[PDB]
Design a protein around this ligand. Structure first.
Ligand code: HEC
Ligand code: HEC
Ligand code: HEC
Ligand code: HEC
Ligand SMILES: [Cu+2]
Ligand SMILES: [Cu+2]
Lengths: 106, 106, 106, 106
């Protein structure tokens, strides 16, 4: 999609997890978010349309995305091991990368 | 997806990346493999239908999707950093994980 | 340290962790847990002294060592933000990875 | 310990990883760089002695060791499967997270 769209894609599935009924709901959000990640991972955001894509600062906006996905599929290692409340909670305790990025980069 | 088509996409991108020129195809191909081995996460294997789905075998079967998916995203990290070939590199070392499964759960 | 030793260390620091009181008292045994898991990662127990170091069945064994200290730090990663009972919770899913391996190769 | 000397632990061990020819040298070096990361993780650098441990400057700063030990361990993977060319070829690559959190927070 586009950097801004992707970001609402993840605003969606992150409350649909918090809402999560079952273990497929979670499983499906987490999918459509690492899906939704990668797409962001390759964008240049507003601010840093001045830093090279080689810049230390782009590595890191790009590494914010790294981190995120690791946090996601580690939520998926808890959705697929039968326990959703702990997966749900990895998905809340996830906003720490979210705000991390924004503050640096939005 | 069904397992063996997930596995086919997996294999097919493992060839793309192997035969890739630049940052995109690697990124695009590893982005595909992601969703792919994401999906197989839950998909169930024949040889483990006679183990509970909340068993240490089934845990340790899904756990190999955890991994896999990460070497993929770690490679994506170098793909998404311009380090084209060494994403191709990372692509090949992946294959410890893929195998390690096959020799346990195929 | 050889095998059994890295283990009980990993298995003592677990108890230390469950009961402990502060994020810095649960830190240092999640670091202990790790450091030992690093030294366990070179190991080759009896059930796999059987097979080769290039064996995939060797590679899968030294992969729960990858997983584990992966999630050890996902657990270390919560202590550091004042999240104690969450990172003591991570300490408890994290043993489905002690699980995985024992059910295969001990 | 205080973070200061942690950040010269890490550096030299890079000196001592690209000053290897074989496993343990590249396999142990990386070992203690993980301890190196582990303790630093908790410390408040000079430049955030004004912000709260709940703050997204800190969340992010100490997320940067999260990564690191991933990139380290991940290069210890290949160190343990025997792959020195591939774990050294990969330790110097971690580079772009050394110099990523420097430029931001150092
Ligand atoms: C590295 C990313 C991988 C590649 C390349 C392939 N796989 Fe797998 N895989 C696994 C099992 C138990 C099967 C059996 C299929 C079934 O029973 O229906 C498969 C299947 C395949 C196939 C072909 C299957 C066919 O009949 O056509 C290919 C070509 C293939 N896989 C390639 C196990 C696993 C697994 C468990 C965690 C890992 C991660 C991978 N395989 C990874 C790869
Ligand atoms: C937390 C993640 C873990 C705990 C807690 C324990 N293990 Fe391990 N383990 C593994 C093997 C292959 C052995 C063989 C023992 C031998 O060498 O004879 C063990 C052993 C233990 C022991 C008993 C030690 C003794 O004989 O005196 C305990 C209490 C124990 N383990 C607890 C394999 C693995 C492994 C593979 C990657 C995982 C990650 C762990 N074990 C993890 C834990
Ligand atoms: C690794 C970096 C990264 C993290 C992670 C990230 N964002 Fe963003 N986010 C950005 C950037 C850059 C912008 C501003 C992009 C722009 O203005 O074009 C942004 C902006 C947004 C926007 C503005 C949308 C718009 O269309 O104007 C929303 C909504 C948002 N983030 C939600 C989220 C949520 C929810 C999460 C976690 C589920 C998240 N973001 C995680 C980098 C990130
Ligand atoms: C998570 C953030 C982060 C990581 C990752 C990081 N640094 Fe540091 N670095 C810092 C901070 C903060 C300081 C300031 C040290 C102080 O005086 O407390 C620093 C300082 C240093 C120094 C100067 C030591 C001094 O006494 O001033 C060196 C050398 C250094 N880092 C090397 C490295 C290397 C090599 C790596 C990667 C293996 C690395 N750093 C990774 C944050 C980081
Ligand atoms: Cu965090
Ligand atoms: Cu990087």
């Amino acid at each position: 999609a586009d950097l801004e769209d992707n970001m609402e894609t993840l605003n969606d599935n992150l409350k649909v997890i918090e809402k999560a009924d079952n273990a497929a709901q979670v499983k499906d959000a987490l999918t459509k978010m690492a899906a939704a990640a990668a797409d962001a991972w390759s964008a240049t955001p507003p601010k840093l349309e001045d830093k090279s894509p080689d810049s230390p600062e782009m590595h890191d906006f790009r590494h914010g995305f790294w981190i995120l996905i690791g946090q996601i599929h580690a939520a998926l290692h808890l959705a697929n091991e039968g326990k959703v409340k702990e997966a749900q909670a990895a998905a809340e305790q996830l906003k720490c990368t979210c705000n991390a990025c924004h503050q640096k980069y939005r």
